[PDB]
Amino acid sequence: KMQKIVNHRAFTFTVIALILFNALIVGIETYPRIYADHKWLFYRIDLVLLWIFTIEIAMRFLASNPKSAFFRSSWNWFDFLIVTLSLVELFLADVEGLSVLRILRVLRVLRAISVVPSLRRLVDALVMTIPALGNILILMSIFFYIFAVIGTMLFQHVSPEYFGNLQLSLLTLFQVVTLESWASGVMRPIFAEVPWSWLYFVSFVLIGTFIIFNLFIGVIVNNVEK
Amino acid sequence: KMQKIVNHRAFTFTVIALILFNALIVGIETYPRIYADHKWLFYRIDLVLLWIFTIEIAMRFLASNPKSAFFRSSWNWFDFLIVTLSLVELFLADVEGLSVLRILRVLRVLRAISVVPSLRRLVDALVMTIPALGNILILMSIFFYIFAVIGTMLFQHVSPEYFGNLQLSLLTLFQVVTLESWASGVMRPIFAEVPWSWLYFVSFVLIGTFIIFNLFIGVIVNNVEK
Amino acid sequence: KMQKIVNHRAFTFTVIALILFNALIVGIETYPRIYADHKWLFYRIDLVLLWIFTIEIAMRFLASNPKSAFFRSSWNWFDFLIVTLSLVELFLADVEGLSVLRILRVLRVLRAISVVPSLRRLVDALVMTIPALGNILILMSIFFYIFAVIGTMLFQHVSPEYFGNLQLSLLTLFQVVTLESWASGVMRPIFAEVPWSWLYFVSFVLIGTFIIFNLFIGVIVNNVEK
Amino acid sequence: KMQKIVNHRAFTFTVIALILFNALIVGIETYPRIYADHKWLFYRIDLVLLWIFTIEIAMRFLASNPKSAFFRSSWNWFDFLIVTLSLVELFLADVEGLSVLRILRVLRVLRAISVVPSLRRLVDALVMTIPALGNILILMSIFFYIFAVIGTMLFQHVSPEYFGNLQLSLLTLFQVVTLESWASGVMRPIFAEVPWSWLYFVSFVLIGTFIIFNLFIGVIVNNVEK
Numbered sequence: 070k071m072q073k074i075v076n077h078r079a080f081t082f083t084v085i086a087l088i089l090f091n092a093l094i095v096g097i098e099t100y101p102r103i104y105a106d107h108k109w110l111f112y113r114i115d116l117v118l119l120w121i122f123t124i125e126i127a128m129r130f131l132a133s134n135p136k137s138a139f140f141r142s143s144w145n146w147f148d149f150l151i152v153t154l155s156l157v158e159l160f161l162a163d164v165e166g167l168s169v170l171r172i173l174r175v176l177r178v179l180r181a182i183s184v185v186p187s188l189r190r191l192v193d194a195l196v197m198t199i200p201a202l203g204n205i206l207i208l209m210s211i212f213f214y215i216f217a218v219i220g221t222m223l224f225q226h227v228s229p230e231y232f233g234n235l236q237l238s239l240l241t242l243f244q245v246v247t248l249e250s251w252a253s254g255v256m257r258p259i260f261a262e263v264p265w266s267w268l269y270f271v272s273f274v275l276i277g278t279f280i281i282f283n284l285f286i287g288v289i290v291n292n293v294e295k
Numbered sequence: 296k297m298q299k300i301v302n303h304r305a306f307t308f309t310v311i312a313l314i315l316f317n318a319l320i321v322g323i324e325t326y327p328r329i330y331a332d333h334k335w336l337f338y339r340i341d342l343v344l345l346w347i348f349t350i351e352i353a354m355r356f357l358a359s360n361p362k363s364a365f366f367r368s369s370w371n372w373f374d375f376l377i378v379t380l381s382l383v384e385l386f387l388a389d390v391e392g393l394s395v396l397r398i399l400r401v402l403r404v405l406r407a408i409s410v411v412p413s414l415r416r417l418v419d420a421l422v423m424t425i426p427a428l429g430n431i432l433i434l435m436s437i438f439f440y441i442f443a444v445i446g447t448m449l450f451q452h453v454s455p456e457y458f459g460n461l462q463l464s465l466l467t468l469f470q471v472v473t474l475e476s477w478a479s480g481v482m483r484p485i486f487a488e489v490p491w492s493w494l495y496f497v498s499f500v501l502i503g504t505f506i507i508f509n510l511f512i513g514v515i516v517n518n519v520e521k
Numbered sequence: 522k523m524q525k526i527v528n529h530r531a532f533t534f535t536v537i538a539l540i541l542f543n544a545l546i547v548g549i550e551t552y553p554r555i556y557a558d559h560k561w562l563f564y565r566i567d568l569v570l571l572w573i574f575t576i577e578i579a580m581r582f583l584a585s586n587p588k589s590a591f592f593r594s595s596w597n598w599f600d601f602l603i604v605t606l607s608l609v610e611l612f613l614a615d616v617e618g619l620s621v622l623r624i625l626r627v628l629r630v631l632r633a634i635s636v637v638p639s640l641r642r643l644v645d646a647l648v649m650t651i652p653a654l655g656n657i658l659i660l661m662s663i664f665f666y667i668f669a670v671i672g673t674m675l676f677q678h679v680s681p682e683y684f685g686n687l688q689l690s691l692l693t694l695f696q697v698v699t700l701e702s703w704a705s706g707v708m709r710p711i712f713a714e715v716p717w718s719w720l721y722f723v724s725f726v727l728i729g730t731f732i733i734f735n736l737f738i739g740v741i742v743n744n745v746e747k
Numbered sequence: 748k749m750q751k752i753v754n755h756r757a758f759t760f761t762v763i764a765l766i767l768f769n770a771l772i773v774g775i776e777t778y779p780r781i782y783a784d785h786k787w788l789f790y791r792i793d794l795v796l797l798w799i800f801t802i803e804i805a806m807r808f809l810a811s812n813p814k815s816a817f818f819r820s821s822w823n824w825f826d827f828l829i830v831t832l833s834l835v836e837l838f839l840a841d842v843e844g845l846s847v848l849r850i851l852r853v854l855r856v857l858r859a860i861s862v863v864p865s866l867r868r869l870v871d872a873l874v875m876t877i878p879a880l881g882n883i884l885i886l887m888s889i890f891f892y893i894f895a896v897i898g899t900m901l902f903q904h905v906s907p908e909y910f911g912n913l914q915l916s917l918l919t920l921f922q923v924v925t926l927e928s929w930a931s932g933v934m935r936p937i938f939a940e941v942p943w944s945w946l947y948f949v950s951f952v953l954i955g956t957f958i959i960f961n962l963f964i965g966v967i968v969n970n971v972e973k
């Protein structure tokens with residue numbers, strides 16, 4: 070009565086192949102003409118692929134010793150979430166708010182990183198180094214917030230474009246920490262009006278960079294040790 | 296008569312929570328309409344928060360064994376400086392020179408990194424690696440100064456914008472070492488007139504980069520060792 | 522009857538010198554006037570250099586113990602491929618499709634990295650670290666594909682320039698991961714129309730960067746170990 | 748009769764202080780008005796500083812055991828070269844070709860890195876890692892040359908600006924390897940005409956980057972070892 074043996078060689082291979090085909094079709098469908106000429110087929114195949122993933126994860130669930138740890142392990146929670154999101158897409162297909170709904174029709178491909186064990190191990194390892202660089206991110210958040218607040222009150226009425234709110238300015242402070250056109254297009258047109266403005270960026274760009282550098286190093290000599 | 300026990304669990308927790316609320320309100324206040332509609336409340340809460348921080352640091356001072364090392368430790372000096380700067384803001388509120396005065400109303404949030412011990416330890420560690428990369432910064436300063444002097448006499452009358460003074464040119468030499476639009480907007484419009492100008496940037500961008508790279512490495516294989 | 526001894530000191534030296542001269546002439550020939558004034562000489566020297574390389578590699582082949590491992594080693598396969606490509610150039614000289622044919626007249630210089638042993642060892646070592654960073658590249662490919670698909674359906678009709686197809690958009694997603702004008706010229710003119718668009722880039726630029734950082738580290742603490 | 752003892756504490760201190768003052772004055776002199784109003788003083792002080800450096804290095808020479816190794820050590824050769832260059836400036840002051848002559852009036856400050864021993868040791872160490880990354884630079888040179896040649900024949904008549912010669916194009920290939928506006932301003936206006944052009948940059952920007960990354964790593968795990 071118990072479901073004892075369920076696993077075999079292609080038990081995954083077929084799933085990953087199917088996911089690849091899913092990616093292929095969901096990519097193709099993004100062409101206006103080709104999609105607009107064969108819509109019934111795309112409809113039917115999307116439905117059937119949805120149902121395959123559904124019955125797949127359900128098969129694993131039922132044959133995963135329910136009362137013991139299946140929903141206890143996070144990976145399967147992630148799989149389940151992905152399938153539920155595809156279902157949300159389906160059963161709430163096209164009321165109106167579809168623009169940010171068709172998108173979820175895509176991420177069903179990234180469950181690839183769940184099935185192939187090497188990618189699973191790699192991604193879990195990558196996440197396991199997030200609590201390593203924990204504090205540094207808090208420091209960087211403090212830094213960003215302080216500088217955003219300081220900017221939005223200084224340059225509010227000289228550059229409404231970049232420094233207009235605490236939200237909008239929290240953008241200009243991001244595309245500057247990445248050293249992206251921070252001089253000729255963020256500063257030179259401001260530094261022209263308020264001449265003492267430079268002390269802002271030349272400070273931020275400095276200290277920000279420093280922190281980032283150290284953050285990077287903080288990880289490097291952590292894997293030499295572990 | 297002596298103040299023996301003063302510490303407990305929330306002895307910090309309440310302070311850091313209050314600081315968070317301080318950040319929240321000082322952020323909100325940067326909206327023109329919302330601040331302009333409820334100013335009395337913002338006034339009163341700013342005053343009361345100021346007084347809370349004041350009585351807090353004073354409590355620590357009095358219950359910090361005055362004659363022994365309290366003002367001897369630098370962190371408390373930093374705290375005291377921050378509180379005094381907020382006070383400078385208050386008692387010298389709005390004579391006229393307020394533009395660069397309201398700013399100090401902000402950095403009172405960064406004393407967060409003082410109170411939570413993990414951030415304190417991290418920041419102290421980060422500073423402790425400044426005397427490590429001591430010389431390299433002297434070398435980089437020499438380099439910057441030399442190249443600024445060399446530029447301002449060559450391109451003074453062909454590009455008044457970027458190379459106009461030893462000060463202004465010390466900017467163009469900064470937004471070039473960060474590889475920010477150094478070619479199409481700093482050089483191509485100059486390289487057009489003085490054709491041999493390229494040897495300037497292609498030298499600087501080279502050597503500067505080299506130094507920086509080495510500086511970075513100079514830190515990396517210093518934490519593998521310590 | 523067997524070819525026993527074939528090697529000596531300059532056995533390579535002459536070849537690398539000749540290759541250097543080949544580079545020199547193939548570089549010179551890219552000037553319109555100078556090439557257009559002495560074409561017969563360039564013709565004849567190109568022919569003779571081709572034949573020198575031909576007889577060279579053929580000499581090695583015949584005096585490389587044919588039945589045993591000569592074509593078994595990959596380097597010689599690469600050499601042979603290069604010579605055959607030069608020959609393809611010659612015997613299929615100028616039917617019409619020459620634009621992407623004259624190019625192969627160039628890469629015959631890079632066989633330099635085959636002959637000088639230090640470069641050979643270095644390049645082989647560099648390649649030997651490709652299977653090291655194997656998975657991370659698969660993860661990055663998945664990431665790129667997902668984000669390209671997600672972009673091309675959102676911004677298809679607001680920015681036909683950058684996001685027009687799954688191909689063209691796979692470019693805009695490349696010159697953004699390199700942080701090249703990703704804000705002022707890829708996003709600000711889009712973020713103006715669809716205001717919620719920022720969550721796209723600020724996500725990608727984030728996660729992409731993270732992956733890349735880790736990839737880099739994944740190699741660093743792999744040479745400390747091997 | 749022999750010069751036995753010549754060294755003492757300030758034997759350097761005075762020299763480095765004087766060099767600092769030299770930097771200060773040579774910087775000041777770059778202002779048009781201020782220099783144009785007091786020229787006699789600047790003249791006389793430049794002359795006297797020149798003579799101080801002269802007599803200084805000559806003192807060291809004579810009291811450096813001439814027949815034994817003084818000119819044998821490279822640092823003193825560098826010092827001597829710098830002083831001779833200042834002298835070239837003086838005795839060949841203003842015939843006409845002064846534009847690239849006043850410049851040498853500057854680098855006399857960088858002899859600072861000779862006198863202060865910490866900087867001397869650091870700079871010598873930095874140079875001692877140039878023969879470490881020897882081959883990689885040869886590989887990068889090969890790469891640059893190949894791609895420059897390949898570009899200048901493809902895009903010669905569609906973008907005369909960037910790809911016009913083997914020299915000029917060797918610039919556009921430099922401000923692209925640094926990821927500086929390589930997409931929106933080097934490629935998009937070219938990729939519009941020759942549509943298959945992308946395979947150029949997306950290749951170069953790829954492989955170049957790879958090499959650079961590896962070069963960096965090639966140094967990192969060389970100081971963990973030495």
Ligand SMILES: CCCCCCCC/C=C/CCCCCCCC(=O)O[C@@H](COC(=O)CCCCCCCCCCCCCCC)COP(=O)([O-])OCC[N+](C)(C)C
Pocket residue numbers: 089092093096097100102103181662663665666687688691
């Ligand atoms: C394991 C999970 C990872 C996922 C990896 C991906 C796995 C699955 C990959 C799936 C790829 C998706 C395929 C979609 C292409 C459909 C063909 C097409 O559109 O032709 C179009 C033409 O267009 C052309 O002329 C050229 C078509 C090739 C461009 C495809 C780019 C490659 C994407 C690869 C991305 C690689 C991702 C990595 C990137 C670093 C037709 O439309 P049209 O404009 O009307 O032209 C009319 C032509 N006609 C006259 C003949 C009618």
Ligand SMILES: CCCCCCCC/C=C/CCCCCCCC(=O)O[C@@H](COC(=O)CCCCCCCCCCCCCCC)COP(=O)([O-])OCC[N+](C)(C)C
Pocket residue numbers: 208212215219223262263264265266267268269272276394395398399402405
């Ligand atoms: C790990 C986390 C680390 C956190 C560290 C983060 C550090 C925070 C970084 C803060 C950056 C500072 C930004 C302020 C500079 C811009 C000001 C400006 O431009 O306005 C005016 C400059 O008016 C002046 O004269 C100011 C001259 C220098 C003031 C320096 C301010 C230092 C603030 C305290 C320093 C505290 C130091 C530290 C304290 C402990 C411009 O002129 P105006 O008056 O507006 O006149 C009208 C405009 N008009 C000119 C067109 C007519």
Ligand SMILES: CCCCCCCC/C=C/CCCCCCCC(=O)O[C@@H](COC(=O)CCCCCCCCCCCCCCC)COP(=O)([O-])OCC[N+](C)(C)C
Pocket residue numbers: 210211213214235236239315318319322323326328329407
């Ligand atoms: C531990 C110390 C670290 C500090 C961390 C921060 C801790 C404290 C954080 C404090 C955050 C500050 C809150 C201020 C927002 C007030 C609400 C508001 O302005 O609404 C405005 C609307 O605006 C909107 O429509 C959207 C509002 C959300 C934008 C807030 C950005 C989040 C900042 C988070 C930064 C994260 C920092 C990290 C970033 C990496 C109302 O103004 P209006 O334009 O007139 O609109 C009219 C609307 N009405 C019709 C209803 C009237």
Ligand SMILES: CCCCCCCC/C=C/CCCCCCCC(=O)O[C@@H](COC(=O)CCCCCCCCCCCCCCC)COP(=O)([O-])OCC[N+](C)(C)C
Pocket residue numbers: 434438441445449488489490491492493494495498502846847850851854857
């Ligand atoms: C760790 C710290 C390391 C420090 C190292 C830092 C190194 C310092 C780096 C210095 C960079 C050098 C910058 C100078 C190049 C630009 C000059 C120029 O463009 O002007 C002229 C070029 O006129 C020429 O013909 C010059 C040709 C090459 C001269 C090379 C100068 C080397 C100086 C000595 C080298 C010393 C080497 C080292 C010595 C020990 C332009 O033409 P024009 O004459 O003006 O004519 C009028 C304009 N017109 C054309 C429109 C009509």
Ligand SMILES: CCCCCCCC/C=C/CCCCCCCC(=O)O[C@@H](COC(=O)CCCCCCCCCCCCCCC)COP(=O)([O-])OCC[N+](C)(C)C
Pocket residue numbers: 541544545548549552554555633888889891892913914917
């Ligand atoms: C080991 C394998 C690695 C390969 C390494 C390379 C090894 C082999 C290197 C080969 C180099 C190729 C030489 C070609 C130059 C020919 C001379 C010429 O064109 O003169 C032109 C003038 O142009 C000038 O005025 C200046 C010429 C010097 C520019 C050459 C750039 C150096 C390229 C080095 C690249 C270094 C690569 C590294 C870069 C990091 C003449 O044409 P014109 O316009 O009509 O002028 C008329 C003048 N006239 C009046 C006198 C008639």
Ligand SMILES: CCCCCCCC/C=C/CCCCCCCC(=O)O[C@@H](COC(=O)CCCCCCCCCCCCCCC)COP(=O)([O-])OCC[N+](C)(C)C
Pocket residue numbers: 168169172173176179660664671675714715716717718719720721724728
């Ligand atoms: C290692 C690999 C890691 C892979 C991770 C990769 C993660 C993937 C990253 C995906 C990035 C997400 C991009 C979507 C954001 C842009 C949407 C947009 O702008 O359209 C609309 C926003 O409409 C809204 O109101 C949306 C508000 C936020 C929605 C957030 C979407 C999250 C999707 C699920 C999150 C799943 C989380 C994870 C699930 C497990 C714009 O407005 P409009 O509706 O079009 O109205 C008409 C236009 N008009 C405004 C001009 C009138």
Ligand SMILES: CCCCCCCC/C=C/CCCCCCCC(=O)O[C@@H](COC(=O)CCCCCCCCCCCCCCC)COP(=O)([O-])OCC[N+](C)(C)C
Pocket residue numbers: 436437439440461462465767770771774775778780781859
């Ligand atoms: C150890 C070796 C390493 C070398 C390190 C350097 C050591 C030696 C450093 C020497 C520094 C050189 C000093 C030159 C300044 C002269 C004063 C001046 O020009 O005033 C001008 C005004 O200009 C101003 O209004 C502000 C002047 C300060 C700008 C100086 C920038 C600091 C350079 C520091 C670079 C730091 C390098 C590091 C950078 C990272 C006057 O000219 P004017 O325009 O006509 O104004 C009229 C005013 N008036 C009405 C009163 C008349």
Ligand SMILES: CCCCCCCC/C=C/CCCCCCCC(=O)O[C@@H](COC(=O)CCCCCCCCCCCCCCC)COP(=O)([O-])OCC[N+](C)(C)C
Pocket residue numbers: 620621624625628631886890897901940941942943944945946947950954
């Ligand atoms: C460590 C050192 C490593 C060294 C590695 C360095 C590798 C070297 C990297 C070289 C980069 C390659 C650059 C060439 C691509 C651009 C060509 C182009 O755009 O012209 C044409 C594309 O015409 C085509 O149809 C070409 C289609 C793809 C050809 C691929 C070329 C591969 C060359 C061999 C590959 C060898 C692989 C390796 C061999 C061993 C454009 O069209 P048109 O024909 O001009 O028509 C007229 C213009 N019109 C369109 C406006 C009307």
Ligand SMILES: CCCCCCCC/C=C\CCCCCCCC(=O)O[C@@H](COC(=O)CCCCCCCCCCCCCCC)COP(=O)([O-])OCC[N+](C)(C)C
Pocket residue numbers: 260261262264265267271272275432435436439462463464465466469
């Ligand atoms: C916190 C970082 C600062 C560093 C200080 C270092 C010394 C800083 C030197 C001088 C500082 C003060 C100069 C006096 C001028 C002040 C006001 C002024 O006139 O501004 C003038 C220029 O403003 C500049 O020139 C900014 C200088 C950029 C510094 C880049 C240093 C990079 C450090 C290297 C990092 C690597 C090593 C890192 C080692 C730490 C502009 O105003 P104006 O001339 O009156 O003209 C009117 C305005 N107008 C232009 C719109 C028309």
Ligand SMILES: CCCCCCCC/C=C\CCCCCCCC(=O)O[C@@H](COC(=O)CCCCCCCCCCCCCCC)COP(=O)([O-])OCC[N+](C)(C)C
Pocket residue numbers: 486487488490491493497498501884887888891914915916917918921
């Ligand atoms: C110090 C670094 C230099 C490196 C030298 C290497 C060889 C350098 C090769 C040739 C050097 C000399 C060429 C002769 C031309 C001189 C004058 C000239 O005519 O300029 C011409 C172009 O100027 C250029 O082309 C600059 C070349 C950029 C070099 C990029 C190398 C990157 C090294 C790779 C780094 C990685 C490996 C690093 C390994 C170290 C322009 O003048 P014009 O043509 O007469 O036209 C009139 C002016 N006009 C354009 C405004 C209309």
Ligand SMILES: CCCCCCCC/C=C\CCCCCCCC(=O)O[C@@H](COC(=O)CCCCCCCCCCCCCCC)COP(=O)([O-])OCC[N+](C)(C)C
Pocket residue numbers: 206209210213236237238239240243712713714716717719723724727
């Ligand atoms: C996934 C990453 C997100 C991070 C969230 C963090 C908090 C994010 C805070 C607030 C989030 C939501 C704000 C409410 C506004 C939503 C809609 C909106 O109005 O947009 C508004 C602005 O949009 C922005 O301001 C984007 C904020 C950029 C975030 C940069 C954070 C960098 C993290 C640091 C990385 C280092 C540490 C990393 C630690 C992880 C624009 O719309 P509008 O105002 O209505 O005006 C009409 C549109 N118009 C402009 C075209 C005219």
Ligand SMILES: CCCCCCCC/C=C\CCCCCCCC(=O)O[C@@H](COC(=O)CCCCCCCCCCCCCCC)COP(=O)([O-])OCC[N+](C)(C)C
Pocket residue numbers: 658661662665688689690691692695938939940942943945949950953
């Ligand atoms: C060597 C690197 C290549 C990689 C291949 C990967 C798959 C490449 C996918 C498809 C390749 C071929 C697509 C078919 C189109 C060919 C011709 C064409 O039409 O071009 C079209 C677009 O051209 C592009 O879209 C270029 C795609 C950029 C690739 C970015 C991948 C980054 C790798 C990630 C690095 C990280 C991981 C690294 C893992 C290695 C434009 O031509 P058109 O549409 O006809 O319109 C007319 C021209 N017009 C626009 C001027 C009007």
